[PDB]
Each structure stands twice: as structure tokens, then as C-alpha cells.
Design a binder for these strands. Structure first.
Lengths: 478, 67
DNA sequence: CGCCCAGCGAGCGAGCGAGCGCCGAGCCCCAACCGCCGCCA
């Protein structure tokens, strides 16, 4: 059952708000006095006297007129006498039984017209909005606000003594909290319990946010760190994304986020190792290259798997020795292009050799030549150990343990020093590499090793693991 | 023209009050009244109209009146 | 003669705005530094 919040501002100053009021009315209002009921505990000195009687008479006549014009004396109501910022007011409530919303205005106007020339004896109050109904929206166009039973304990009972003087009603549940703070607090707590029970009954959650999350996830799962691979893999998705104006910065943001997440939490074997199994590995190019040079395919695959996973520790490098165009550069470039963030050693630049090798996954050393000026840092980078370097036109940076591959025709152990050579640093470099004598030359129609071939080779390697002995010279197949 | 708007009448009244009191720089604004400078600065645009009004009042007081 | 249209009105709420606010990208001007030149045995 809804209720209408009728606001009635009770005049405070009878001389300023009700000029010309009869003396008998003021005398009767000042002579009347109330008393705390038997079951009461509120201070009577704080509560006023004449305003209380005025509000009582007002609400009584209002309720009688409502019951007479509605033809329904059996109806629920609720009155509460309070004190505004600088004027007394009330918060009367009447049920909607027999009085619709479209007729509330006419009944209120009739009650207003009946009030004057009867209670005030012709005199009218000066306080604006002395008898109206609370509307929904703030304005003349706002409709009637039909509150509920839960509106009393939510915007009336929580008040205190200075904001609550006397309240009249007929409901049994509210009849006890008419003039008592203990019952008021009890009912307020009992209602707040239910309010909390009903209320009970970071990550951004939105369609665009979830879509972007899934997009960046699926892009990182495929291995697209830049726009180069985005168009190569799926050129339609890039077009669909770039069509939106808001996607311009989002594309770069996703690329940077993927790159950072890979540089922080990702390993090379994850992308190097294929997902689906392989049933025919003999057709692979790496398998043929390894079988033509006499090397055991299974042993070479296990060595590569152990080197990619840093299983050997110090021996975390592979060196393909042999003439040019013998299956070294092909496999090296294939393994370097398969994984994102591949490095490149510039042996020609002795000042900044390990420049393009920071934040990489596969350090490629094409035609390397060890020298006395790059032997110390090389011994640390090849052995899988943290060490700082000096970049070209950039600040220094550390190179975490990352797999390294070398492919050259000259002797890497031989340390060159101008017009001479020394083999002092022979054992340190020999105990940290995997020499692969690839002396057999391939045919002109062999073709380059694609990216899927490396994945299939690594997958077949993971499926067939064998004991790999820590040695410099790899054992050739029988 | 002319154009009437609730957002322009306040600006015109502010310009008139500034020309009447004679606010030269922004320091005198706080001296004459702090609540006004706080309210006009609390807007979303912040300092998009304060400098404009200051320059307008200065130019008006310069071209019209003199020392 | 106690109803008659029936003529009147007073809102009356579900609409209509329109006007502002607060982002949202999107240009725009400005300052701490790079390239190239002057300066002497």
C-alpha cells in the first residue's frame, strides 16, 4: 500500500506568519499543555508546547477531512512533527485507498480551502508551501511520489530528537514508536537488518573491455608482437580492428603489452615446441639436414631441446661448424624467425658487439669471429649468466640467460688479436658450446626451412627425449 | 545584434563588477573577494574565462578611462 | 423540485524539449636537447 508524503509547514511566529490572528486562538494554544505517556522516556523540556498542539490540531483536522472526503475511515496513516532549518513542519502520510493519483490534487485543494476560514479564521500563512504534497521531480511538472512502507524507517525514524518531536499513527508496528526513543531505535535497527539483508541479496567489466582482453590474449597466443606479423597471419582482423577510430591507440597499447608480457613471462621453447603432434617427421628439412651429415637425428633433436630449455646450464649454446651453405644459415634463420624477439650479434663492431641482443629469445650469431676484445663478455653471455653490456647510441642493459646459436666456418675457439692468434681461452669456450660438423653441402633445390618445420621438429624432439651427455663434440650417428 | 543566455549574463555581471571595483591583476581578485574567485575557478574549464575577463576589463578601463 | 447536462475549471502526469557537464580524443604551442657552423697554433 503506497502513501502520499503531504508536507505541511506549521507557522512558527503567529504574529509574523499569521497577522491579525484572534487573541482567543493564541490564548487557547498557549494554555494547552501535554504530558509524556506512561510508556515514554523522552525529555519533555526539549520538546515545545504550543507548536506541538498546533501540529496535533492540524494533522487531526487533516485526517478527519481525508477520511470524510475518501469515504473510508479505515485507512493507514503516519504523521511526524519535526523542526526544519528555521520553521516547523510535518511529514503526514495517507494511504491511496479510495484516492487515486489524478484526484489527489483536487482533494488536497479542497482540504486547503477548508482549512482557511475555519482553523485560522480567515487569516492565511505567509510561509510558502504551507500545505502541498511531495512531488517526484523538482518542479511544477513533477508528478505525485507514491512512497512505500519502507520510506518511514529510511527518511523519518533515523532522525533524532531535534529532528523528531511527536509522531502520530495507527499502525500496530508503528503505534509503539509514537513518543519513545527506545522503541524508535528498536524499529530502526530491525528495519536496517532487513535493509542490509536485501542489499546483500579491481577488474573492469564491460563488452569493450572483455573484447579487448580476449583480443590481446588471442594475439599473444599466436605470436604477433608487431604489425608485420598481424597482416601476414590474418590481414582481415587487422583491417576490422583499424576501422574504428578508437582502435588506433589501442592497437599500439596491445602490441606493447604483449611485448612486455613476453619479455617478462615467456620462454623460447613454448613457441618453438609445436602444439599438434607430428606423424611424418622424415619429410622435415631439419631432419634431412641432420641425417645427411651423419648426426643422429634423435640425439641432435634431444640436444636442441635441452639447449632451448636451458637444461645443460653452462652449455647453453650450439655452434654449427662447416663450410657455407651447408644447412647452418638456413636452420639458424628459421629458428630465429620462428620466435618473437630474436637477437643479432655484430662481431664487426668491436665497440658494441652485443648490441641487438637485449630482451631477446634466440641470439643469432651469423659468421661469428671471437676476438680478444670480446672474449670476457662472450664467455659470460654464452655460459648463460647475467652480465651488462654497452649498446650503440644507447644506455647499458643486462642480458639475462637466453639461448644462443652460432654458425660460422672459422674456428670460434681461436681468439684473434690483430696479427696473431692465441688458444688460451679454448677450454672455456669448448665447455659451453655444441660443435656440429656440417660438412655435407645441400642441393640448390632444397628450399628454406619454414616456421612450421621448426615447430614440428621441436615437437618431435619433445616426444622423444634421450640422455644427452655434456660434451663439446657431438656424437655422430652410426 | 545581441544574444541572451543564462551563462552569458553571469559573465557580463562579473565583468561589470570587476570594472566597478577595479581589479587589475589576479592578486586583487582574492583581496576583494575570495569566494567569487574560488567559484569561478571551480568550473570544469578552470582558467579558461578568468584570464579573458581580466584582459577584457583591463582593455576596457584603458581605452575608455585613463590615469 | 431534486436532478439535468453540461459548462467550467484545476490541475496532471507522461511526454516534449533544451541546456549544461563531464569525458574523449584531437590538435597546438613550448622547452631541454641534437646537427651544423665559428674561432686560433
Amino acid at each position: 500500500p503506497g502513501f502520499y508524503e503531504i508536507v505541511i509547514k506549521v507557522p512558527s511566529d503567529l504574529d509574523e506568519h499569521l497577522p491579525g490572528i484572534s487573541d482567543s486562538f493564541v490564548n487557547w494554544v498557549a494554555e494547552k499543555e501535554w504530558e509524556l505517556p506512561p510508556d515514554s522516556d523522552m525529555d519533555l523540556n526539549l520538546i515545545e508546547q504550543a507548536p506541538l498542539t498546533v501540529a496535533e490540531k492540524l494533522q487531526r483536522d487533516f485526517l478527519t477531512e481525508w477520511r470524510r472526503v475518501s469515504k473510508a475511515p479505515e485507512a493507514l496513516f503516519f504523521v511526524q512533527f519535526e523542526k526544519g532549518e528555521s520553521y516547523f513542519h510535518m511529514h503526514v502520510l495517507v494511504e491511496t485507498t479510495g484516492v487515486k493519483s489524478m484526484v489527489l490534487g483536487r482533494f488536497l485543494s479542497q482540504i486547503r480551502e477548508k482549512l482557511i476560514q475555519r482553523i485560522y479564521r480567515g487569516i492565511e500563512p505567509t510561509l510558502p508551501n504551507w500545505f502541498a504534497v511531495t512531488k517526484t521531480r523538482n518542479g511544477a511538472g513533477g508528478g505525485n511520489k507514491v512512497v512505500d512502507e519502507s520510506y518511514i524507517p529510511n527518511y523519518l525514524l533515523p532522525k533524532t530528537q531535534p529532528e523528531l518531536q511527536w509522531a502520530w499513527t495507527n499502525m500496530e508496528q508503528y503505534l509503539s514508536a509514537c513518543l519513545n526513543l527506545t522503541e524508535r531505535k528498536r524499529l530502526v535497527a530491525q528495519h536496517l537488518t532487513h535493509v542490509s539483508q536485501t542489499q546483500e541479496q579491481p577488474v573492469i567489466r564491460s563488452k569493450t573491455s572483455a573484447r579487448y582482453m580476449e583480443l590481446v590474449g588471442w594475439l599473444v597466443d599466436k605470436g604477433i608482437t608487431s604489425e608485420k606479423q598481424w597482416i601476414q597471419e590474418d590481414q582481415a582482423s587487422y583491417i576490422s580492428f583499424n576501422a574504428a577510430s578508437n582502435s588506433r591507440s589501442q592497437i599500439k597499447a596491445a602490441l606493447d603489452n604483449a611485448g612486455k608480457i613476453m619479455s617478462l613471462t615467456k620462454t623460447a621453447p613454448d613457441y618453438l615446441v609445436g602444439q599438434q603432434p607430428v606423424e611424418d617427421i622424415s619429410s622435415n628439412r631439419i631432419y634431412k639436414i641432420l641425417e645427411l651429415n651423419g648426426y643422429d637425428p634423435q640425439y641432435a633433436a634431444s640436444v636442441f631441446l635441452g639447449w632451448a630449455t636451458k637444461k645443460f646450464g653452462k652449455r647453453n649454446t650450439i655452434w654449427l661448424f662447416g663450410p657455407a651453405t651447408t644447412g647452418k644459415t638456413n636452420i639458424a634463420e628459421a629458428i630465429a624467425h620462428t620466435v618473437p624477439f630474436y637477437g643479432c650479434v655484430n662481431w664487426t663492431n668491436e665497440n658494441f658487439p652485443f648490441n641487438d641482443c637485449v630482451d631477446k629469445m634466440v641470439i643469432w650469431w651469423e659468421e661469428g669471429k671471437m676476438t680478444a676484445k670480446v672474449v670476457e663478455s662472450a664467455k659470460a653471455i654464452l655460459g648463460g649468466s647475467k652480465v651488462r653490456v654497452d649498446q650503440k647510441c644507447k644506455s647499458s642493459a643486462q642480458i639475462d640467460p637466453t639461448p644462443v646459436i652460432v654458425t660460422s666456418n672459422t674456428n670460434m675457439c681461436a681468439v684473434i688479436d690483430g696479427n696473431s692468434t692465441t688458444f688460451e681461452h679454448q677450454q672455456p669456450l669448448q665447455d659451453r658450446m655444441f660443435k656440429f660438423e656440417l660438412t655435407r653441402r645441400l642441393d640448390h633445390d632444397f628450399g628454406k626451412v619454414t616456421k612450421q618445420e621448426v615447430k614440428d621438429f621441436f615437437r618431435w624432439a619433445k616426444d622423444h627425449v634421450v640422455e644427452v651427455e655434456h660434451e663439446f663434440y657431438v656424437k655422430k650417428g652410426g
